[PDB]
Design a binder for this molecule. Structure first.
Ligand SMILES: *[C@@H](C)C(=O)c1ccc2c(c1)NC(=O)CO2
Ligand SMILES: [Zn+2]
Length: 140
């Protein structure tokens, strides 16, 4: 699975966070499926600060990056999988595209930087957890 490395922060899907993530916790929110932990090394990624609805995401289950149009971050209902239950998720963006369990954490990027990470899949839709509202990732 994938993550964002910005400053001394590591941004992951909450349900895939490790014990080391939880032991170095900065912030977490179940409703968004996001968790941020602290890092010793500085990261290479820049977070987008924008309202773009077009970008490119990485799909591990295809070994491919795909250009997509996506919705603005919203409170959305997510169906059950073969291996997890159904629930409302907040700050979620949807696009038409392929995702499945191996694709968690793939980056969605726009011309301004990282928009979010792959979070959901079903019925030809990929959902992304937005990070562009988390301005505190840019400092401290
Ligand atoms: C996990 C964070 C993730 O991004 C993901 C994408 C697509 C799908 C799943 C998880 N799980 C499923 O069951 C279906 O597709
Ligand atoms: Zn942008």
């Amino acid at each position: 699975s994938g993550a964002i490395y910005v400053g001394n922060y590591r941004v992951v899907n909450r349900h895939l966070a490790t014990h080391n993530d939880w032991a170095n916790l900065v912030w977490e929110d179940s409703s968004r499926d996001l968790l941020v932990s602290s890092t010793t090394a500085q990261g290479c990624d820049t977070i987008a600060r924008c309202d773009c609805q077009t970008g490119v995401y990485y799909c591990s289950s295809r070994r491919k990056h795909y250009p997509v149009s996506f919705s603005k971050p919203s409170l959305i209902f997510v169906e059950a999988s073969e291996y997890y239950p159904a629930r409302y998720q907040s700050h979620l963006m949807l696009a038409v595209g392929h995702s499945e369990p191996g694709d968690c954490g793939g980056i969605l990027r726009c011309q301004h930087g990282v928009v979010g990470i792959v979070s959901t899949g079903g019925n030809g839709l990929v959902g992304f957890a937005d990070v562009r509202d988390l301005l505190w990732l840019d400092e401290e």
